[model samples]
Target: SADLRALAKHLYDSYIKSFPLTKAKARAILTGKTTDKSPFVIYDMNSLMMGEDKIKFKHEVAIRIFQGCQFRSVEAVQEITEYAKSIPGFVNLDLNDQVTLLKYGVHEIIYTMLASLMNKDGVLISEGQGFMTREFLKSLRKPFGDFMEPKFEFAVKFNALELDDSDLAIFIAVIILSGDRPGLLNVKPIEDIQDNLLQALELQLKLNHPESSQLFAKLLQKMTDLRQIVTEHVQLLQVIKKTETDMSLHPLLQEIYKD
Candidate 1:
């Protein structure tokens, strides 16, 4: 039995090294702080000090995930309380407190989550496109003098960690290695990736949240205009192609007559 315990411990440690989500590093990340001397590393240390808030970790995470995904309901609320107490970090919560926190946090999380999710003008999608565009430019082969600007920016800026590049590489590699799905399909991971990417942006440079949000709002409007302009441009190309061989087809004249 002792040998079996030893084996189990070894496997658990390996799992901790592999996942790191339920580890010390995770705690550091959640608390919104960086690890020491580690490059590109983030610690989810939200639970550094156990509080009188009377909420269990498992329930809190489940509430956040569910609310984040817009699955908020009384039944969903009821289930998460019972469910979270059974998870690893949440065993400390009694049945009553578990239920209470679920109801409480679920409402707040759901409110913010829904506000962020449904609105294309809200937060997440705007951040995604902004990051994607930034990276796209960085991937371009333009000369230094050819630098240009984005039509807009995200409402929130990002912050980067101070970990070594190699460690950062390993962190990304682990995400790839772990693969996407394991059991019940959920959007928490996707939200987390987006959030982490945002965090990265915040870390890379200092910018006010209000300023970032305002930037994203302006960009969204510009992008909408750009899409319409591009559509008209394509239509113009078709107009020219259709009339190129016809002598009677004075496209410019046709436009003048229509005017």
Candidate 2:
């Protein structure tokens, strides 16, 4: 239980470190008040647009979401990296191998916790006050605009696991600690860390939510499901690059976002 105890302390400590927006505030933003001010610029299209302006405007909206969110995604990187770094044995991996793990692991980690930000219709943006409806994303111009839907779909289904931060910490650590990330020079150490994380996962579940004989199975299953979403994430990044020639992603994201 020593290892399990460490995971718990770091999980909650890092929880606030990573996500300052709580579900309470997240839900409150959608209940009628929002601060999506200024086009950032994605404004409600309750009015009219000129013929040529319509296409231009739609793509602008995509840029707004993609570019706007990319800024926050950088924050997510700083936030998430805090947790990953705290995972026991994470720093012991090859320095090069560590980047490999994070490059592949960020999307899965971000989306797994996306459940906390979503309810059914949309997700909070611009930090806590701004909101984006699913219909808005679905209405955008091609390639990766609506690719966001699957994340919410995954978030929707994955919420069934109903995990607290403590359990989620181990699962997220498992994401980066795995032996499968390509080009790893030291696979055995990666596997060793993952094995310990699995042990912690079982212990935490058994200690707290032991009623769930299937919880362990379900949590691991979502990891694979999260893995499936990674391809779509790649496609989304490609769409961003293909469509928005002028838009810039954070350097860190740019590094991991491509093949």
Candidate 3:
């Protein structure tokens, strides 16, 4: 329990205490409530583009969701970049490796965060305008469905695990420091950091979730699931790049997927 205790202390100091948004506020924004005067809004495609072609409406909806996901992904990367620097030893890595980890890890982490906002029916989308139901998402064109469907599948199971914010903080830390990602110049050091994190995470899970003996194992499995989901997401993005010329990929995302 000592290791878990120390890990808890570090997690609070490095992450939980300084987490940018509170659960209540985040939920409110996610659900489309007023956030600082101007409410976050996501328009329904049919209503917004009334009288437009049905095909065009579907495509626009897909694009909007993709854009919103990309925005969240960028925010996750920025937050993780700062958080990693504050953690001891993470900042010592070569800049190139740091970028590699962030580039590859951002989507996985974003999906994890997005999972927090999910409901049984579907994820809250467009800030409250609509919930992206699994059925509705599947109706979208080919690769567009691929972009979101896998994430929804992963999110539902992950939410079933019911991790708290503290659990998420440590879990995200582990995801960001992975040494096993391709093109890492130095693997051993990153692996060592990840091992330390996992040890701490194990202890934290036991301490916080005493009733469930399998929680840690389950959490680890979710991380693996995240990896596969991200692989599929990247493939979808690549296909979109090749086929969807009308819709543009964001430059930052372009750079991320290009690498």
Candidate 4:
């Protein structure tokens, strides 16, 4: 076990290098500028790393829990089922299919990170981790990016490099569902929402001239506004006590979100 804070920091920091374009673009759209780096910085590297180690140790603890004869609590099943429904696109899948899809995604993320480590050269550990840690983490980062790239590409596969309507729809939906505030979501939605936005994009392009690209560009700005609305709605859900906290559910929910 290394450090929980460190691991989380690594996860947060690497998200940019991991998903580069989408992450960066999302940041720019929200902040009104591209160069504004997150004020977040990692201090107390040792403490952070220790947090990560605690997380790992807990995993081992969980293993012992699973080994016990007690299994299949109703709360667990309800949690899982509610989670599937709460995810943005999960309802699109049929019952059995959704469950299976969730299971696959659960394993995919854990293994995906390990794979990313294999491909990257100096990504995982901070440079201060000395040459060994730096090299080891970096080696993992490459494959992490590689593993994630296909998913990003797959989302954009149908549309031209330009953003489209289907992508917009999905992007807007994601913003509404994502926890970010409206202004923030507006900027960030473009990253994932493009999957749906692209669908409408072709139609937008067909009707408009080169000048129309300008119009779409303006709509691109509107993403911030849309994000605000989405943020409001998500907050409303919280008022209704519809919040979620289970980490295990994220993988499957995220899978539904991506697909």
Candidate 5:
């Protein structure tokens, strides 16, 4: 009877509320003002100036920010892993299918989650503090510089959708189980799961979000936009693969980046 509702609760607890990375938590972790504690420094455009002789001076900083993302996402794979296991039909997915979903699905969820930590100008980082200005990120040179901007663009618009935690719960579910993702041994389970989410969201939005003004349609629109971001994200990752020589890629993120 309350099947969808229960999933909603589970998603909030397991996903949204358990949202591991954010400005506040990162700030606190950095705040003790004890180990590697510094002043109220927000990793902004100014921070880059410290690294003179910048590769294409801009190139180096671009890589720096890109790596900074890796730092922020250390917990992402596992947190998302935890949520994937709890999806009603998710665990039942073939192991390969399961891996497919996680691989393709995690970044969109991260992009979506970033809305919580972002603003019109930039996103918050450690110190409960540093705001990485959108202007700065966009200023970076090719490949690395371009990578994060779309997410900022997408996330900024996404936050305006104003979905609550429970609403987002189902939102991310639909994203992962999407049949559109490349390599799936079986599509039926995902298709079936996706429809349930559509039906559930369709019903829930009407009852709960009076001003939704056809919210579901807009979300489907956002899905297309999210896909564009994903496509671009993958394209950039390919460039990073060949270009990035100095830094090691995070193994977990690398898994998702692989074709």
Candidate 6:
């Protein structure tokens, strides 16, 4: 058991360092100190654009957000796939099991990390060049806007927990290795692995943040909340696709949602 825990920690630490969201980067962006080049101009209502410019600007915003989501989702899946391979026993599982885990798990883990880009007000976009307010996001044209509300709701509550990047790393690993996904080929082996990860995660939390005795339980509860929010998100996306003929999701995301 200790060996499994050590291996899991090794894999998790490697992922935290390797993945894009580090404590320094997140802290800088959240505290308004980042210098990364922004990808989109902040939307301004009163500055008033002419017809062509207005449509162009709005379309640019839509593209930026959609592209951002697709990139984030793909990157998360890539990192998870690599992490699974790095672990000794995981790579030995049936290829189908590995694929199944990634298909169902990446969105949950990616959404959790995306929460780091938000505060109680709204998500920071374009590398903090702009803040997309809750009201503004909802007002955007159809399905593009529809997808963000559930994510924003989760992010606001998740940010309130003040979880540092290390905590997030372990939490993300736990979700990725989850065995409860439908159609897993060997649930027992995967569940055993998940149990070990959960144990290590719980122990680490106890040692790392002793002030909040209930933090572990609270984090677990947040995962449950995340599942419910994602369920609603999927339902809304399905409905939007059926009703909004002009709107199209990126192929990568469409495939993941199809799974």
Candidates in order have lDDT scores of 0.29, 0.70, 0.70, 0.32, 0.70, 0.69
Ranking by lDDT: 2, 5, 3, 6, 4, 1
Give the range of the ten consecutive residues with the poorest summed lDDT in model 2.
50-59
**Worst lDDT 10-window in candidate 1:** 123-132
Per-candidate TM equals: 0.20, 0.82, 0.79, 0.25, 0.79, 0.81
For candidate 2, report its TM-score: 0.82
Worst 10 residues of 4 by lDDT: 123-132
Which of 3 and 6 is ahead in TM-score? 6
lDDT, candidate 4, residue 250?
A: 29
Error of 2 at 200 (Å): 1.1
lDDT of each residue in 124-229, candidate 3, tens digit only: 5443334445666666677776566777788778878767777887888899888878899999889988888888888888878899878988888887898888
Candidate 1 lDDT at 201 equals: 31
Residue-by-residue lDDT tens digits, candidate 4, 44-131: 3443345354332121222222222012222233333443344334455444544544443332322222222221222122211211
Sort by TM-score, best first.
2, 6, 5, 3, 4, 1
- In candidate 3, clashing pairs total 0
Q: Could you give me the TM-score of model 4 versus the true structure? A: 0.25
Listing every candidate in turn, what is its Cα RMSD in Å to the true structure after a full C-alpha superposition? 23.7, 5.4, 5.0, 17.7, 5.9, 4.2
* 1-259 per-residue lDDT for model 2 (tens digits): 8956776667656666666765544545645445422212223454213222422222255565567566767777777887788777888778999888888888888887677677567776655534556777777788645677888888888766667766776677788787988888989988988888788878888877977787888878887778888886776777667766788767887688655
lDDT of 2: 0.70
**lDDT (Cα, tens digit) per residue for candidate 1, span 196-255:** 433433332232233343443332243244334334434543554464433132232233
Residues 91-209, candidate 6, lDDT per residue (tens digit)?
A: 77888998788788877877887788766656655334455566666777776677788888788788877777667767777887888898887888888877777777787777678
